[PDB]
Design a protein around this ligand. Structure first.
Ligand SMILES: [Zn+2]
Ligand SMILES: [Zn+2]
Lengths: 165, 969, 349
C-alpha cells in the first residue's frame, strides 16, 4: 500500500528503479509468500513490476543492464521467468566420471558441435568413461551356427498359439 | 541424489524387551456390567496398550495388554471374573497374531491423544475442524528385525465444520433432509433437528458412558440424528458438517480446418480393527492349510476348521487387490465367490467388455516389437455390509438402503512440498508424547537404509556397446543425443533400406512428403546406418500414386504393388578388377494415412504377403505414418529412422557358397545339416542399435514378462536376454464359453522354444506385470518344480547326442525364480526438501531397499512372500494399464514412483557361486533388480535426453502392444 | 518477427495469409515472455478492429476464413498461459475473448475452455483496476471520524437564521450522504455540545429525523410486510403487521455517557445535561424514536436496577411532553418507577 503510492516517483530516476527492483526479489524468491497463503499477492506484486521494467523502455540499453543483474542470482519460478527476457541457451552434457556414478554437468554452446573435425574437440571422452573394446561376433549369431549340430525339438509355427481351446 | 530427501516414516519405538499378557472371557451364547469393556476403558485411561476383539467361538472375547519395563497395576485394571491364558515376552518369539495386535493397540492410544488436540476422525482420516488443515491417514508395519514404524498419508480435503446451535436452527427450517457426517467412522445420515440439553437425565447417563472410551469435551450436549433410515441419539460434539496442457489440443484443432455407544462399539471391532503390515500386501494363498481363507478372517468374512494358520495371510486385505486388478477370471471368482454377491456383477462386467484373421493379429505384434512406438470396490460394500450387522445389533439393544449410502462421501472426494513437511514436523511431538506416556522425525532414505541393518549410494549406471571405429566401443548413455555428432556405428552393420511411398493425389499433401522423405533419407544416412535410397527404378523419385475412398485406395494397392515387388567403362581402366571374391536390401513400404477403424490400410499387407515369391516375402516390413506430420510439426526424423532399422530383422543366410566340388566332405556336412527339414525357416536375427555391455563357466539369463489384455481372452508375453540382444514376444489365446492350466502351459513351451534354439544352459526369471493370484502359482509351482526340470533334462539328452556328453552345450535350465510386480502406494518422498546437481529436473536415479520379510521373528511352496524389496525411481513411467493402479490410484501422479516386488518360487541348483544359486532369499532379489534397472536403461530414445519411461523394456514393449490392442481392437 | 508484423498496409490480406503459419509455429515461445506477448497483443487487437468495420459475414470468404480464426486463437492462448502481459491491450477490442469465435469440432472441448477464458478474463479485469487505483479513509471507525470531521463542518458553518431551500432539512439530510445508524450517533452528540450552543440546532436534529425514520424505512417495511409469513416462527413473531419496521436502539449510545450528570457545580457538563433532557423531550414530542420500545427498555432498566444510579436519574429527569394520551402508558408509568411510598402525592398536590 505504500510502494503502490510513490511508484510514479520511482520511475523518475534510473538507478533508483534498479535499487528497488532487487530488494523485493529476495522476498519472492525466499518463499515467504506462496500461492496457498495469498493468490492475490502474486497478482499484485508483479503488476507494478511489469511496468517497473516497462519504465526503463518508457532506453533498451538500460533494459539489458538491470536484466543481467537479475538472472545472476537465479510453479512459482514459472511466474517470475515470464517477465524477464528470453535467455540464450547452451547445450548441456551430463558427465559420469566413475562403481559408475554421476558427477557434474558441462555447458557448451551449439556453435562448437560440428562434424567437420574428425575427433571430439568440444567433447571430452573422459566425461563418458569411454572404453575402446575390440570386435567380437554377435552372441546370437554364434548360437545359430552352434545350433546346426544339435537338431533339437521342432519350434511352433507361431500360429499354433492363436487357436481355440 | 535421493539419499538425503525426506520420506514419510516415523520410527515409533522398539519391540525389544516387550512383555504382553492375554486375558480371556467366555460369556453367554450393561457396559459397566461387561467385564471386557470396563477393563478396556480402565486401562485406556491408564495409558497402556490395549486392544479387544472377538473369536471364532460365539460369546468369547479377549483382552491384550502390552507394556515395556515395569508392569502396570493389575489388581484394579482387570475384572474379577477375567483370567489369563498367555504370558509372553519379546525373547520368546512373536506370532503374526501378536504382531498386528500391537498396531491396533498403539492406534487405540494414538486416536485418543489426537481427539484431545482438536483433531476429529472421519473413518481412516484425522482432520482439524475449522492451508495447514489437512486430513492424515495412519497405517502401521514392522520394518527391520524389531523396529516399528508408521507411514502418514496426507490428502487434501474440503474444510469441515463442527456442529453447533446455529446449524440446528436452519435445519428445522429446512424441508429437505439435512446431510451431516456421523461417528468416528464417517457415517452419512439426516439431522432432524431435535437438540438436547446437558441437564437432561437421558443424556446424563449417555455422556458418562461415552467419556469412558472416547475423550469428549467436558449448553448443547446431544442431538437426534437419523442414519440409514434409523433414528439414533448421538452426542453433538462428534457430529460434523462439511462445506456443502489445455493449449496444445487447441493448436492442432486450429490446424484441421484450413489444411449410540453400542453402535460405535461394534463398528470398532471390524472396521478400524484391521491394521496389518504393509510388507504383506503382496500376499497369496495360505501355506498353513492351503486355502483362500485363513487366520482370524472367518469372523470378519462369512464351517471349515482352519487350525493355527501361522502365516501372514489375511483374506480381507487380499480381496481389495483381487477385485479390480489384472487377475485370472477363474481366480477372480474364487476371491469374490460365485455363490455370494458381486460374482454376478464381475461376470456381467467382463461379458459386457467383449460385447480378426490370424495373420493380421500376427502383424500387430510385429510392429510393436521394436523399441520405439463404473465398477464399485468390494470393501466399499463390505463396510456397508458391516453397517447392516452393527445396526441390527444396536436396534436389538433398545427393543438395500443400508448398503447404499451408509458411509459419507467426504472421504472419497478430493499440492506443495513445504506445507506438507510443516505438518510432518507438527505431528512429531504428538507421536513422541504418545509413546512416552524416543521417536525419530522425518526419515531420510539414508536413515531408512541404515535402520534396516543391511548400499545407500544410488545404483550405478551400466554402459552400452557401440562402435566409433570398426572395433567396438563402451559408451555412456549420455552421448545418445550426440550420435550423428560422434558419428558412431551401431550393431547390425548398416542395413540398407529400399522404400515405396503410398500417397493420394492431393498436390499440397504430395509436396510435403517428398520434402519429408528426402530429409528422412538425410537423417538415416548422416547417421551411420547405411543407405536410405528408394527402389532403383525411377518412378517420380520412388513415390507411387493412387487414384469410403479406402476401396479406391485398396484396388490400386493390390493391382499394382503385387507384380512390382514380384559396354563402355571410361574410369574402369586405371584400376584393375579384384576378382570373384565372396545380402539383399531391406524392403519397407511407407504408407500415409489421410484418415485423422483404420485397419483397411493394413489389409494391403495381408494381400502382399500371399502374392509374392518366398524370397521376396521373407523380409517385408510395413511402416505407417500419419499425414499430419508432413503439414504441421526435428526429433521426429531420427526416431522413425532407428525404429525401422530395428525392425529390419535380418534373416540367417541359407546358402553358404562353399563350392567344394567334391562328392563328400566337412563342407558338405554343415551344408547338408543346414537344409535338413527339422531346422526352422526365417530365423530373423535381431540386433538392436545398442546392447548392454558385459560385466566381468558360460551361461545366460532370460527375462520374460507377461500380462493379460483388457479381456481375459488373451495372455500376452515378451522375452529378453540378460544383455538385451534378443527381443521376442508372443500372443496366446484362451477363450471359453482346467481352463487356466492350459494357458499357463502353452506359454512355457514357447519359453522353452527360445532356449532350445540356443545351446548353452540357461537361468529363468519370470516377471508378471500384474499381481499373482491364488491359482496361478499352483500351475507355476507344480509343472515348474525341481523334479520336472530334472525330467526335461533327461529328455533333452535323447534327441541330441552331444547334450549327453557335455552339459555345458546342453541348453538346460539351472535355476528358476518368480517375481511379481505391483505398486505400493503407501510412502511418498519429495525431492524439494534437502536433509551441486539437483536430481529430478534433468536426470533420473534409482534406489533399492530389500529384506527377507520373515513371517515371524521367533510342501513344494513356502511362505507367500519369500523376500520383498522396494523399487523407487526418479524416472517417470509411461501409460500403465488401468488395473495396475486400481489398488491406490492416488499415488499415480507423484514423480518419484514407488514399486513393490516379491519372490514366489526361488528354486536354486536344479542340476545339483552365482547370486541366483544362493539359498539366501535377499540375494536373489538384489541380482535381478539391478539388471531390471539395466534393461530400463535400454529404453532410451536417442531423440530424448533420458529414457522415455521407467520399467524394463520387456515390460514397456508389452505395454506398447497392450496400448495398441487397447486402441485398435 | 514482430517488427515484420507492423509493416503490413491496412486492408490488405494477400500478405498476412502466407505469414499466418509463422504465428503458430513460434507460438510455443511467445508465452514465455510477456513483452513479446504485450507487443503481439497490441498488434493483434488493433488488427481485429479493421475487419469488423458480423463475424459470420467474414466466414463465407475463403480468403478471410483462416484470418479471423487464426488471430482469435493466439490472443486466447496468451492469457491462459501468460496473463501477466495484460493500460491493457484488450481495451481496443470491442468483443470479449470469452465469447470470441473458436474453431469447431468437439463442443465439450469448446464449452470447457469457454468457462476457462471467462474466469481468467474476469481475473485480469479486476487486476487492471488494482493497477489504476495504484494498489490502494476506508477504515470504518476512520470513516466514522471521517464523517465526524466533515458533517460537523457543514453544520456548524451553516447558519440557522434562514431555513432556505438550500438550508432546508429535506436538503440538509440528503447533503449529508450501517452509516445511517452511525450518523444518528454523530448528529446527537453535535446537539449536546457545551462549546457551541443554541437550541435551534436541537430542533433541527429532531426534525431531521422524525420524518426520515418513517419514510425511507417504510419503503422497505412494505416489502417486508408482504413476505413475513414463514411458518409458525414468523407467525409467532409477526413483527411487521404488529408495528411498522422503524429505526430503534439508538438510545443505548447515549445512556453510557453520563456518570453523575445531575449537577450544576461543573459548568461544562451542566449545559450538556440541560441539552440532554430537552433533546430527549423533543424525540418524544415529534415521535422521532420508536417509543413503543423506547418505553420498554427503560422499564427493563427500571425493573432490573434493583448517589443514586443513573437509570433512576434518567427516568426521574426525562421530560415527556405527551400528556393525557393514555393512563395505561403515561400515568401508570410515572407511579411504578419510584418505588413504594405515598409521599410523592403531596408534590403532586
Ligand atoms: Zn496360513
Ligand atoms: Zn541338443
Amino acid at each position: 500500500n505504500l510502494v503502490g503510492g510513490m511508484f510514479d516517483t520511482v520511475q523518475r530516476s534510473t538507478q533508483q528503479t534498479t535499487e528497488w527492483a532487487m530488494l523485493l526479489l529476495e522476498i519472492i524468491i525466499s518463499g515467504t509468500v506462496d500461492m496457498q497463503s495469498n493468490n492475490e499477492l502474486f497478482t499484485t506484486v508483479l503488476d507494478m513490476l511489469s511496468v517497473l521494467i516497462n519504465g526503463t523502455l518508457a532506453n533498451k540499453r538500460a533494459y539489458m543492464n538491470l536484466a543481467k543483474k537479475l538472472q545472476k542470482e537465479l510453479d512459482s519460478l514459472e511466474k517470475v521467468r515470464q517477465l524477464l527476457p528470453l535467455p540464450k541457451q547452451t547445450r548441456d552434457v551430463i558427465t559420469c566420471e566413475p562403481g559408475l556414478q554421476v558427477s557434474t554437468k558441462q555447458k557448451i554452446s551449439p556453435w562448437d558441435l560440428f562434424e567437420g573435425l574428425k575427433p571430439s574437440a568440444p567433447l571430452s571422452w573422459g566425461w563418458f568413461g569411454t572404453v575402446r573394446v575390440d570386435r567380437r561376433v554377435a552372441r546370437g549369431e554364434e548360437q545359430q551356427r552352434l545350433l546346426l549340430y544339435h537338431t533339437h525339438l521342432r519350434p511352433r509355427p507361431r500360429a499354433y498359439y492363436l487357436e481355440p481351446l | 541424489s535421493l539419499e538425503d530427501c525426506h520420506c514419510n516414516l516415523f520410527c515409533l519405538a522398539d519391540l525389544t524387551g516387550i512383555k504382553w499378557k492375554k486375558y480371556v472371557w467366555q460369556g453367554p451364547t450393561v457396559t459397566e456390567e461387561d467385564p471386557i469393556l470396563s477393563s478396556f476403558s480402565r486401562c485406556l485411561k491408564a495409558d497402556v496398550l490395549g486392544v479387544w476383539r472377538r473369536d471364532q467361538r460365539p460369546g468369547r472375547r479377549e483382552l491384550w495388554i502390552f507394556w515395556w519395563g515395569e508392569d502396570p497395576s493389575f489388581a484394579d485394571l482387570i475384572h474379577h471374573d477375567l483370567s489369563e491364558e498367555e504370558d509372553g515376552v519379546w525373547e520368546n518369539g512373536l506370532s503374526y497374531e501378536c504382531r498386528t495386535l500391537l498396531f491396533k493397540a498403539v492406534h487405540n492410544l494414538l486416536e485418543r491423544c489426537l481427539m484431545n488436540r482438536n483433531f476429529v476422525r472421519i473413518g481412516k482420516w484425522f482432520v482439524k475442524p475449522y492451508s495447514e488443515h489437512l486430513s492424515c491417514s495412519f497405517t502401521f508395519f514392522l520394518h527391520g528385525d524389531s523396529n516399528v514404524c508408521t507411514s502418514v498419508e496426507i490428502n487434501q480435503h474440503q474444510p469441515v465444520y463442527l456442529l453447533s446451535e446455529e446449524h440446528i436452527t436452519l435445519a428445522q427450517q429446512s424441508n429437505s433432509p439435512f446431510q451431516v457426517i456421523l461417528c468416528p467412522f464417517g457415517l452419512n445420515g439426516t439431522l432432524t433437528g431435535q437438540a438436547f440439553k446437558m441437564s437432561d437425565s437421558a443424556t446424563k447417563k449417555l455422556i458418562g458412558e461415552w467419556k469412558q472410551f472416547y475423550p469428549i469435551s467436558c449448553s448443547l450436549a446431544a442431538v437426534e440424528v437419523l442414519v440409514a433410515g434409523v433414528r439414533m441419539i448421538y452426542p453433538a460434539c462428534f457430529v460434523l458438517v462439511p462445506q456443502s496442457q489445455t493449449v496444445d489440443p487447441q493448436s492442432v484443432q486450429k490446424w484441421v480446418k484450413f489444411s449410540s455407544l453400542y453402535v460405535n462399539l461394534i463398528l470398532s471391532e471390524s472396521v478400524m480393527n484391521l491394521f496389518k503390515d504393509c510388507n504383506f500386501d503382496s500376499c497369496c494363498i495360505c501355506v498353513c492349510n492351503m486355502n483362500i481363507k485363513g487366520a482370524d478372517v472367518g469372523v470378519y468374512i462369512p464351517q471349515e476348521a482352519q487350525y493355527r494358520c501361522t502365516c501372514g495371510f489375511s483374506a480381507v486385505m487380499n480381496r481389495k487387490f483381487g477385485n479390480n486388478s489384472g487377475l485370472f477370471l477363474e481366480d477372480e471368482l474364487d476371491i469374490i465367490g460365485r455363490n455370494t454377491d458381486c460374482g454376478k456383477e464381475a461376470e456381467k462386467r467382463f461379458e459386457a467388455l467383449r460385447a480378426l484373421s490370424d495373420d493380421l493379429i500376427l502383424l500387430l505384434q510385429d510392429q510393436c516389437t521394436n523399441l520405439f512406438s463404473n465398477w464399485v470396490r468390494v470393501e466399499e460394500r463390505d463396510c456397508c455390509n458391516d453397517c447392516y450387522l452393527a445396526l441390527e445389533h444396536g436396534r436389538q439393544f433398545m427393543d438395500a438402503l443400508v448398503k447404499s449410502s451408509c458411509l459419507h462421501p467426504w472421504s472419497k472426494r478430493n499440492q506443495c512440498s513445504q506445507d506438507i513437511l510443516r505438518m510432518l514436523l507438527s505431528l512429531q511431538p504428538v507421536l513422541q508424547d504418545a509413546i512416552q506416556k524416543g521417536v525419530q522425525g522425518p526419515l531420510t532414505w539414508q536413515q531408512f537404509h541404515k535402520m534396516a541393518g543391511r548400499s545407500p549410494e544410488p545404483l550405478p549406471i551400466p554402459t552400452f556397446l557401440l562402435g566409433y571405429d570398426y572395433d567396438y566401443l563402451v559408451l555412456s548413455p549420455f552421448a545418445l543425443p550426440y550420435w550423428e555428432r560422434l558419428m558412431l556405428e551401431p550393431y547390425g552393420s548398416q542395413r540398407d533400406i529400399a522404400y515405396v511411398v503410398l500417397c493420394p493425389e492431393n498436390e499440397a499433401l504430395l509436396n510435403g512428403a517428398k520434402s519429408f522423405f528426402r530429409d528422412l533419407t538425410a537423417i538415416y544416412e548422416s547417421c551411420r546406418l547405411g543407405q536410405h535410397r528408394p527402389v532403383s527404378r525411377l518412378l517420380t523419385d520412388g513415390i507411387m500414386r493412387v487414384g469410403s475412398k479406402l476401396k479406391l485406395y485398396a484396388q490400386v494397392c493390390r493391382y499394382d504393388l503385387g507384380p512390382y515387388l514380384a559396354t563402355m567403362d571410361r574410369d574402369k581402366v586405371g584400376i584393375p578388377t579384384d576378382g570373384d571374391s565372396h545380402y539383399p536390401p531391406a524392403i519397407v513400404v511407407y504408407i500415409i494415412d489421410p484418415f485423422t477403424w483404420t485397419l483397411g490400410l493394413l489389409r494391403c499387407f495381408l494381400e502382399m504377403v500371399q502374392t509374392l515369391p518366398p524370397h521376396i516375402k521373407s523380409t517385408v516390413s510395413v511402416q505407417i505414418i500419419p499425414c499430419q506430420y508432413l503439414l504441421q510439426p526435428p526429433q521426429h526424423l531420427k526416431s522413425l529412422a532407428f525404429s525401422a532399422f530395428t525392425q529390419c530383422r535380418r534373416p540367417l543366410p541359407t546358402s553358404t557358397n562353399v563350392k567344394t566340388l567334391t562328392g563328400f566332405g566337412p563342407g558338405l556336412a554343415m551344408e547338408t545339416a543346414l537344409r535338413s527339414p527339422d531346422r526352422p525357416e526365417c530365423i530373423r536375427l535381431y540386433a538392436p542399435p545398442f546392447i548392454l555391455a558385459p560385466v566381468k563357466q558360460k551361461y545366460n539369463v532370460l527375462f520374460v514378462g507377461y500380462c493379460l489384455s483388457h479381456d481375459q481372452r488373451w495372455i500376452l508375453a515378451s522375452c529378453t536376454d540378460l544383455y538385451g540382444e534378443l527381443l521376442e514376444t508372443c500372443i496366446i489365446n484362451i477363450d471359453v464359453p482346467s481352463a487356466r492350466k492350459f494357458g499357463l502351459q502353452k506359454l512355457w513351451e514357447w519359453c522353452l522354444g527360445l532356449v532350445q534354439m540356443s545351446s548353452l544352459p540357461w537361468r529363468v526369471v519370470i516377471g508378471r506385470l500384474g499381481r499373482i493370484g491364488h491359482g496361478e502359482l499352483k500351475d507355476w509351482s507344480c509343472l515348474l518344480s525341481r523334479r520336472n526340470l530334472q525330467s526335461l533334462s533327461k529328455r533333452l539328452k535323447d534327441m541330441c547326442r552331444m547334450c549327453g556328453i557335455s552339459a555345458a552345450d546342453s541348453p538346460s535350465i539351472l535355476s528358476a525364480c518368480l517375481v511379481a510386480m505391483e505398486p505400493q502406494g503407501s510412502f511418498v518422498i519429495m525431492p524439494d526438501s534437502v536433509s551441486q546437481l539437483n536430481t529430478p529436473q534433468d536426470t533420473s536415479c534409482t534406489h533399492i531397499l530389500v529384506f527377507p520379510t520373515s513371517a515371524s521373528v521367533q510342501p513344494n511352496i513356502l511362505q507367500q512372500p519369500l523376500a520383498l524389496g522396494y523399487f523407487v525411481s526418479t524416472a517417470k513411467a509411461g501409460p500403465l494399464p488401468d488395473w495396475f493402479w486400481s489398488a491406490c490410484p492416488q499415488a499415480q501422479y507423484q514423480c518419484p514412483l514407488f514399486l513393490k516386488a516379491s519372490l514366489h518360487l526361488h528354486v536354486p541348483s536344479v542340476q545339483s557361486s552365482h547370486p541366483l544359486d544362493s539359498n539366501q532369499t535377499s540375494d536373489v532379489l538384489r541380482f535381478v533388480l539391478e539388471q531390471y534397472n539395466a534393461l530400463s536403461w535400454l529404453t532410451c530414445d536417442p531423440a530424448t535426453q533420458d529414457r522415455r519411461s521407467c520399467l524394463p523394456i520387456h515390460f514397456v514393449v508389452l505395454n506398447q502392444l497392450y496400448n495398441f490392442i487397447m486402441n485398435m481392437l | 518477427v514482430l517488427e515484420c508484423f507492423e509493416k503490413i498496409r491496412p486492408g490488405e490480406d494477400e500478405l498476412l495469409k502466407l505469414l499466418l503459419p509463422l504465428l503458430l509455429r513460434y507460438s510455443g515461445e511467445f508465452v514465455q515472455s510477456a513483452y513479446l506477448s504485450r507487443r503481439l497483443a497490441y498488434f493483434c487487437t488493433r488488427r481485429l478492429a479493421l475487419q469488423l468495420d458480423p463475424f459470420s459475414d467474414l466466414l463465407m470468404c475463403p480468403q478471410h476464413r483462416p484470418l479471423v480464426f487464426g488471430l482469435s486463437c493466439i490472443l486466447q492462448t496468451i492469457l491462459l498461459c501468460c496473463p501477466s502481459a495484460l493500460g491493457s491491450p484488450l481495451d481496443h477490442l470491442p468483443i470479449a475473448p470469452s465469447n470470441l469465435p473458436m474453431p469447431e469440432g468437439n463442443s465439450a472441448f469448446t464449452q470447457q475452455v469457454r468457462a476457462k477464458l471467462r474466469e481468467i478474463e474476469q481475473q485480469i479485469k479486476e487486476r487492471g483496476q488494482a493497477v489504476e487505483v495504484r494498489w490502494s479513509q476506508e477504515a470504518t471507525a476512520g470513516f466514522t471520524i471521517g464523517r465526524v470531521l466533515h458533517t460537523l463542518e457543514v453544520l456548524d458553518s451553516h447558519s440557522f437564521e434562514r431555513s432556505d431551500f438550500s438550508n432546508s432539512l429535506d436538503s440538509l439530510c440528503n447533503r449529508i450522504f450501517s452509516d445511517d445508524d452511525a450518523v444518528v450517533s454523530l448528529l446527537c452528540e453535535w446537539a449536546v455540545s457545551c462549546k457551541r450552543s443554541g437550541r435551534h440546532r436541537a430542533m433541527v436534529v429532531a426534525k431531521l429525523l422524525e420524518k426520515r425514520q418513517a419514510e425511507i424505512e417504510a419503503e422497505r417495511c412494505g416489502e417486508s410486510e408482504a413476505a413475513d409469513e414463514k411458518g409458525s416462527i414468523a407467525s409467532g413473531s409477526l413483527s411487521a403487521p404488529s408495528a411498522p419496521i422503524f429505526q430503534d436502539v439508538l438510545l443505548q449510545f447515549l445512556d453510557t455517557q453520563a456518570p453523575m450528570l445531575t449537577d450544576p457545580r461543573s459548568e461544562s457538563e451542566r449545559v450538556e445535561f440541560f441539552n440532554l433532557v430537552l433533546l430527549f423531550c423533543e424525540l418524544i414530542r415529534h415521535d422521532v424514536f420508536s417509543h413503543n420500545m423506547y418505553t420498554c427498555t427503560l422499564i427493563s432498566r427500571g425493573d432490573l436496577a434493583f448517589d443514586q444510579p443513573r437509570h433512576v436519574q434518567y427516568a426521574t429527569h426525562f421530560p415527556i411532553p405527551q400528556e393525557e394520551s393514555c393512563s395505561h402508558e403515561c400515568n401508570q408509568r410515572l407511579v411504578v418507577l419510584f418505588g413504594v411510598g405515598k409521599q410523592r402525592d403531596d408534590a403532586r398536590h
